[PDB]
Structure 1
Amino acid sequence: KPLVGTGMERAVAVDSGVTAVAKRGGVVQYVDASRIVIKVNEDEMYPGEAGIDIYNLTKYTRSNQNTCINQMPCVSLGEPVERGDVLADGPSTDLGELAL
């Protein structure tokens, strides 16, 4: 992360699709380098639904400029999350902040 920043890094990282943003709040039922399974909260759960969200991170995929696209999980097992919270940092991203 940049030691001296402007505070716009979080907005750029969140708005861009490189990072993984939780759709609904809940707890991290299962965390892994490849996939993340999060159990949504009771209130946010739709009727007649299992109640889990699966995010499949893209690992070591080529870009248009022959670079590497890597997503690393940023949450631990059992850590509660809310809507709009970053789950996995994308390329050049540190804890939801742009890291060029």
Structure 2
Amino acid sequence: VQYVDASRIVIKVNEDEMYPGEAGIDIYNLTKYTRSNQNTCINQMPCVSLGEPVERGDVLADGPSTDLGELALGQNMRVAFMPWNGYNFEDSILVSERVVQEDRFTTIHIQELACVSRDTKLGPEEITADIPNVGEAALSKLDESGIVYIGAEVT
């Protein structure tokens, strides 16, 4: 591996398999916390650390529901079988506060909100750049353009 980052996987390839035509190296840009079909966070994660060669047809990155090239759907831990004060009634499972206290079991749902605009026959639509009858609070979160700064939190 030549330059392992989180967003890129630069491989300094061995010459016995490196192309005798314009040398060559392996660059792989990993999907970064993007949106999926089910609006769930998909992110290829760099498993191979810096300072380690690889085999041909081997792996460099994992993805969600997968770990170190192994299909990991959920998580496994200490389970016991006993009807405990109705907390296992009909379908009910009883869980230790530890899971949410660790949040090793949390899903990140990212949402894409398309903004329609651009020229109507009655007014050449711009992306605001100014909001009437309200304060500068609506713009202290936006810029001169009217686009909210990357890194905020809405609700």
The answer to whether the superposition gives a TM-score over 0.5 is yes
Give the TM-score taking structure 1 as reference length: 0.69
Residue among 30, 38, 60 paired with 1:65: 38
Give the TM-score taking structure 2 as reference length: 0.45
Q: Deviations over 1:20-63 (max 9, x none)?
A: xxxxxxxx001001101001111111122232110000011111
Residue among 38, 42, 47 paired with 2:20: 47
Counterpart check, 1:96 vs 2:69: yes
Deviation at 1:78, TM superposition (A): 1.7
Deviating beyond 6 angstroms after TM superposition, the runs of 4 or more aligned structure 1 residues are none
The match for 2:112 is none
Deviation at 1:97, TM superposition (A): 0.2
Q: Deviations over 1:48-97 (max 9, x none)?
A: 22321100000111111111111110011120101121101111111100
Counterpart check, 1:76 vs 2:49: yes
Mapped to 1, the partners of 2:27 and 2:58 lie a distance apart of: 15
- Unaligned runs of 5+ residues in structure 1 are 1-27
RMSD (Å) for aligned C-alpha atoms: 1.0
> Percent same amino acid among aligned pairs?
100
The structure richer in strand per residue is 1
- Corresponding letter in the other structure for 1:61: T
Partner-residue secondary structure (3-state), 1:99: coil
